[PDB]
């Protein structure tokens, strides 16, 4: 109802700044910060790929990428608007579906045990600092849920 | 009033920058756990430093720069935006004092986390600075509260 | 038509940035050769990763942003600039598929290079992502081809 | 006498650029460049905190921060001027007092011997490259002394 | 013939972007990525200085530096033009002469054997990733050859 | 005259940038002292490299870009600003030649500092480049002197 | 039948010399020669104690000790003879019972996987050279079986 | 009686030899203290293993083979030599049980000695054997006591 | 005949002693497997050196000094003791040649055992000697066979 | 009084066996078992030479050597007897004097702090297992004191 | 001339004791004491086998072995004498021939440079303490030369 | 006279045994060269310790127990055997003093051998003892000379 387009940009910018702080001074290169109790070359890297196929940061990076493309299409069409919202919804929903099916959040595995091939046996791989992630997520998740609801609202109003 | 808020805002930003980049840095790497047991250190971190000071304060400025944007958007709630700007800035203090029990920085913590074979001496690096920079980043918050309380109450 | 080209162009740029900076990174350092023989790893790199994906795609965008500049210069050849913009973007795909035999990222390669005393297990790091980001950076190319084929043929 | 406000900005910018070169390609992360002849976890970090409580760079960072706040207050008052100078003096004096009482400059301890608790005994901790600091300081000190005198001058003239 | 001044700037920008990607995500700090089969302090550094006196990146950096100075002189003379080209040619030719006499390209030694003084004997020093250099070069060379020919062309036309 | 000064000024800036960032770098870390005695290397640095070339030249450009700012300030002394601009640029040469005894870069120095148990071989890294870049950064200074001498004398 | 007392001493001496070669130039300090794929202090020692409570060598040492005591008692009684045999049998039988119930021979675990407390997880501990043990055993076992049968024979004859 | 004493004497000697040479060995080296603090291990030894079992038993056989030599010397006190031979052999048991609190061998001890930064896990090696060999070397002592008590009392 | 048997017997003993103590030694420790994978080396031992030469020959002299003791016992079968003394000494040769495929000592073996990540170069130490000492310890056996064949056949 | 010559040989043999067990399975190569909290080549060796100039074992070795020479002289004179005792006393007294002035026993420094030249500073050197030495000593000392008194007794009786 | 059989046994025993001291407290396990400036598994072992095929100690061990067999044969023949000398000569001559052709003595390579296959290149392998070998040899050589001459003398006298 | 020779002979033997086995030991391993250059230490040994004291004295007793055997052989030259027994025992002193410049043991030597990059501090271990044991093993020699001089001269 016209207020929506405000809170969308507010939460958009907010989620962006959070995504920056996350990627920069938290996640970080996590891996390196991924301590595998072992001595078997590739055990750590493979356990990481196994339990962190697509890191949270780059999922969210892609989330904002794809879910800022239709809103850019409209800007070109001017100088389909409802369609760009529909997209802006299902994408932001998709990146959430893949998230929950992958990491089974919102928690953040404190400790993982990997039995990958290089690894001689089941070894204790430690995640690094994961309260300060389980969280950021939360925010990056909640913000997405709201950003859904507002877009669904506008979409529904425009079908009236 | 409105002047000193923006002054201390920019001031706290600059302080926060210097803190994050030079003082704190990647505190972890700069964290020395007397042991040899993979993950004792990292866990003893997430225990004694769940959310680092820098990433609390980043969030502080974020959430406490959000209401001030809503007013600039309505101009195609001000008093409400202040109310928010207060309770957030208060909350980010509450979580701070309940968590770290400041304003002092623990020079040394002893961790008996599960990975750790036993109680081990984990050293923090450069706690004196870190304290100073909290002291500033806290005092500034207290003041920013007060000025918003007088502005809000006056109106 | 012209719109979706620029959209997917900027899109592929952003994808390429995230890839180069966060995903790939300095892949090498993040490359773990089960051995202890100086240069076994590096050689086994230049064998199985002659030109990294990032520095192919950097060149892709370069060469496939060159014809589009000639037209802006003539304005003190357009159809020819498209023709180029196609065959380059096709070439950078040909070299890709002939080289790495994608679209999948080899999880593990076994190198018997000269420095290596024998066949040794060299592990690649994080191939799943890397695959995903290729899949996007390839699909985008296929589309960018098609749209230029319809635009070129139409004219 | 109107020439003062020029040389203030000149020396201000000069000290800034010097502060950059200092922090970036000299001091650096000093610590790391702080070689403690030992093998006792935390001996180096504690000796460092003991003998470098607030590093020179961040003292000076704070110096320019606080001593560019009143000069910003006036810019807001326009769109008290003498008061902003008084502040601009006593602060720049304060950051000098704390400096001399802390590091007893202008020299720069080439070598320090630390008997902190973690350290088993008195150990030789080495500072890293300290001619190329003892100096920069000098400059960052002298510039401050001048920047005092010019502000005291203006302040005194304005009391006439 | 007026088209020249276009393709010069095109190839100039192109070579620049290539020089960036080269220096940043390829060459890199090569050295570090220079594996000397040894254990003798300074053997690697000296073999490097011996076989890579002036790295390719900084040769090319200097190439663009010197070969963008006359074209800047003219911009000052306006607010000698043929002379600035003559320079722009012989310099770009010089940086090629030094290149071929130094590295005997366009190839890129995959492996070098160094018998420098620190080194106890002839040791196998490995260059790091050199298909992905032998190349970039190629480009940075070919572009230079073309950028010569176009400038020689303009120069010759202006002598008519 | 005034033209070639600014040309060579910007030129020397670019040279200085490349030197500081790529050639010199953190020279220290790139400094290999044949020993095992904590602080032998660092001291042998501050002995044979008191003020690195990069941080002399940074200061050179600073002090020799200061007088040229005073004139832009007076415009709400020019000849005096030149005189300064000469004697500084001369001084930064004097300290250079008296200190390092250039223009050559010492390939290898032998340090018998106190931490060092004895005379030890400390290797410098990549002295040939470093020499070249001094040669340019020195020649440029000599020229910048001459042009200011002719401009100053002419007036 | 009088020939027995010969072959007893023959096989006794034979088993002794074999026990020497075993303990000296085979078993050895086995442990040290017990490679636990790990890095967790005490994992190897505990896995060893778990899977080699009483090493083979010292079982056999004790075997010959106890099973040369009655045959010494008789030598004192002279300067009960059947009783000393009965003992000499049941002991040599006992040291075999404990052997088979402990190591489930005659094989010799080439590789053992230990999940002891110090060990972070199930880790691959390697036994060292175990064809050249599985064997010696065999001999030290077979010899015992024969040394039983001969003593049982004499014992039975003397009950007639 | 006199027979079984010499039998069990020679027996306990052989047992003691095997213990000292193969089982115990240089126990220390075979002692694994979860730490990295020079002397934590050694001190935690002298605390939990003041006098090793082998060097108690060596002394046991020494002192309990001394009276039996005096009688062979008088023959150029026998009952007195037995009395001694009893009280010594009893004493070497008393010190054993009061010290180690056997007959079991402590599989694992946790030491908080001064050198140690904290309580650390020190592992003993091969305690099961060591127990067995004590069990024999103790039982033998108990018997050697009894037989001397019956011989002494009988007389 | 009987003389030269005892001569060559004592001779082969001395040779065997020097071999076991100085030449072979603890061959293992003196065994250098180009790898870093716990147990690759040990397994590659038990594969390529199931029963070391020293502990075959120890057994050779044992079993081939057993029949010669039975005759000294019967004297409170001689021809039978020779027959045994032959077939044993023949057997210990058969197992040798079928196992190691001598008389040469493999300078270098390449092991792809399970622990090993791949085929790795395991070096043997000092194979030339070891060969020589086999050559003697084998030739001696061949002769000791022949003399017993002539003595046995003659009778 | 004739009983003396018995208890001398008894205590002589006793002290010998104790000296064996000491040197073999206790002292050992002590050094190696001498843990100097440092990383400075020669600090440990020099601190050892400083605080253990002549190890206890070799003092006692020499003690028995010299104090079994006169008792051997008499055996040659037969195939001066009082003189050989006088020697046998003053020597055994000498080796005790040097002992007490050197190690200030009977205790055994658990921990020593060495500031020798190689050592950068006062460092904590740890002695290895010293209850099980402080002791043996005791015995090797007491036995000497008795062996004195018995020889002094005989000597005095023979002066009557 | 009857004096020969004395000096033979004298020099025999002398050479034996020298051979003991050599093998025990000099040569030693030399290898270990064989420092190859490298880091390439097997380079040291192969260079050793290359330049020390049969170590000096075991050549000499074999020398005394073979050259004490005929002198034992005669002892059996009694309870051919000239033949046993002839052997005793040619053998002791043989072990000298193999020695000089192998090690080209009497010197003792202080330093050897090995280019074996495992070794990446020509590497500096250091022999350990070789004055104190070049020597012992000398003695073990000279003694052999004399022990030849005396046996040749006796042999010649017995051919008269 | 003849008595005290054999006394001091056996005495010097026992001293030599204790020296070789416990004091000196494998001196090398117990030799600490402040460096990291393969073979600097070993060479600096053979320079400052060509023939170790133990292996000089072993030879001393050998050569100075050889003449005393010739006399026992002639008994199926005595004065000549003494003369030899003197000049040898004198020679083994001459080589000692000319070589090591005793009687003191060099606590510390500084080696600039070829392998060594420079002059490096090589520490000797336990020189005080070693001195003492030389002092005895030398004094004994001086006496053994004197007694043979009086015996030889008297005759």
Residue numbers in the entry:
A (entry chain A), D (entry chain A), E (entry chain A), G (entry chain A), J (entry chain A), K (entry chain A): 18 to 96, 135 to 215
B (entry chain B), C (entry chain B), F (entry chain B), H (entry chain B), I (entry chain B), L (entry chain B): 21 to 96, 135 to 213
Reported in the publication:
Connexins (Cx) are a 21-member family of integral membrane proteins with four transmembrane (TM) domains (M1–M4), two extracellular loops (E1 and E2), a cytoplasmic (CL) M2–M3 loop and cytoplasmic N- and C-terminal domains (NT and CT). Cx monomers assemble as hexameric hemichannels (or connexons) with a central axial pore. Hemichannels from adjacent cells dock to form intercellular, dodecameric gap junction channels (GJCs), which can cluster to form gap junction plaques in the plasma membrane.
The final model consists of residues 19–95 and 134–216 for protomer A and residues 21–95 and 134–213 for protomer B. The Ca2+-bound Cx26 structure was used as a search model for MR to solve the structure of Ca2+-free Cx26 at 3.8 Å resolution (R/Rfree=0.301/0.333). In addition, the Ca2+-bound and Ca2+-free structures are nearly identical (average Cα RMSD=0.4 Å). The most significant structural differences between the Ca2+-bound and Ca2+-free channels occur at the Ca2+-binding sites. E42 also adopts an alternate conformation in the Ca2+-free structure. The carbonyl of G45 moves ∼1 Å closer to E42, resulting in an additional intersubunit van der Waals contact in the absence of Ca2+. Specifically, the Ca2+-free backbone between residues W44 and Q48 shifts an average of 0.8 Å away from the pore centre and slightly towards M1 of the adjacent subunit. The Ca2+-free pore had a distinctly different electrostatic landscape, characterized by a variegated electrostatic surface with a strongly negative potential in the region of the acidic Ca2+-binding residues. In the Ca2+-free simulation, K+ ions rapidly entered the channel and clustered around the Ca2+-binding sites.
